[PDB]
Design a protein around this ligand. Structure first.
Ligand SMILES: */C(C(=O)Nc1ccc(OC)cn1)=C(\Cl)S(=O)(=O)Cc1ccccc1Cl
Ligand SMILES: [Cl-]
Ligand SMILES: [Cl-]
Ligand code: NA
Length: 351
């Protein structure tokens, strides 16, 4: 004649209960006859009893700064049992919203990292990383690395293989991300890796050679940064692409009428670094393309070739610059992720 026993995922009088998980009640030596949970305003939280009557769980996300009262009743062959539990959830000092790139359903190149950018500084980087679940198919190992206080990146050791599915579940709602900062919401994104496209700009030849799945499909002469403002070597990730884009140097503090000033509407511009390196149309430098470097760091190419590049590259394709007189693109540029050695990237910078 055992009385039914009830087990809850919460404790009476608990405080700071995180809302990153549903609340459940389980019955033994009997079944749940009724389970209810209401907040301080009397409003119930949606839940569902399992078909066998042994498990009840909330199906609606709980809220912050709330007081919940949980009531459960179990009936068994041996009698009846009831419990009442009250608890209070986390009271964030501030919330932060995550933003994920690339976009959901996108087809990206083999260089595209997963990016999760928050709208606030993240004090507990480890908590953030733990709340982000990455699925890859075919599965490959990857690791997180922070570009700054708000944006973390995830990538494998080598370029993605085409045909790879990437699933990104940012499960930050209810997660304490440090110093009272909690996740404002969850985000779900999924994308796929398309064709391997790798363009190599070699300063020795001043040719930009585009290889699609290992085959050279296009060669175009280029003029890169002049010796005083050279184009950094390294691996660049293709970012945004513009049919045309207005650029004004005074926007960033450089007068237009200075030696390094400019104010023009640029055609067929493909971004390959946050620092400002673009592939774009440079009709004025057609003669120097393939012979001498004349730009401020951009890879200048012909109008038809710049349009060709715009048409044939996608977000996440790779541009690799070699043999310039400049240094190496910073790994934390924003599109320079691949320039960090794997051992450093894997080790991370969570602490
Ligand atoms: C790239 C760049 O270096 N463009 C460039 C500078 C100078 C010359 O003279 C031959 C040719 N191309 C960029 Cl993103 S920029 O910051 O310098 C803006 C700019 C300025 C002039 C022309 C095009 C562009 Cl995108
Ligand atoms: Cl630049
Ligand atoms: Cl720029
Ligand atoms: Na309360």
């Amino acid at each position: 004649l055992l009385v039914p026993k009830l087990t809850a995922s919460v404790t009476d009088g608990a405080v700071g209960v995180t809302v990153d998980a549903p609340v459940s009640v389980t019955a033994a030596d009997g079944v749940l006859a009724a389970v209810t949970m209401v907040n301080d305003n009397g409003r119930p939280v949606a839940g569902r009893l399992s078909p066998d009557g042994l498990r009840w769980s909330t199906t609606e996300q709980l809220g912050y700064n709330r007081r919940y009262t949980l009531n459960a009743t179990a009936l068994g062959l041996g009698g009846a049992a009831t419990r009442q539990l009250t608890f209070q959830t986390s009271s964030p000092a501030h919330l932060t919203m995550p933003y994920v790139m690339p976009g959901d359903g996108e087809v990206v190149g083999v260089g595209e990292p997963v990016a999760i950018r928050f709208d606030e500084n993240i004090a507990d980087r480890g908590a953030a990383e733990k709340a982000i679940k990455i699925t890859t198919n075919p599965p490959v190992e990857g690791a997180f690395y922070w570009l700054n206080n708000r944006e973390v990146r995830w990538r494998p050791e080598h370029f993605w293989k085409p045909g790879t599915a990437v699933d990104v579940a940012v499960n930050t709602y209810g997660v304490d991300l440090g110093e009272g900062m909690f996740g404002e919401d969850n985000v779900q994104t999924h994308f796929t890796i398309g064709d391997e496209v790798i363009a190599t700009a070699d300063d020795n030849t001043k040719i930009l050679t585009v290889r699609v799945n290992g085959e050279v499909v296009k060669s175009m002469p280029t003029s890169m940064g002049k010796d005083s403002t050279p184009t950094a070597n390294g691996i660049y990730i293709v970012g945004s692409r513009y049919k045309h884009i207005i650029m004004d140097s005074s926007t960033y503090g450089v007068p237009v009428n200075s030696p390094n000033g400019y104010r023009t509407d640029v055609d067929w511009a493909t971004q390959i670094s946050y620092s400002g390196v673009f592939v774009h149309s440079a009709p004025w430098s057609v003669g120097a393309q393939g012979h001498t470097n004349t730009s401020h760091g951009c890879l200048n190419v012909s109008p038809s070739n710049a349009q060709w590049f715009y048409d044939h590259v996608k977000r996440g394709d790779i541009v690799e610059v070699v043999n310039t007189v400049g240094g190496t693109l910073p790994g934390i540029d924003g599109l320079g992720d691949w320039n960090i050695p794997w051992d450093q990237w894997r080790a991370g910078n969570a602490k």
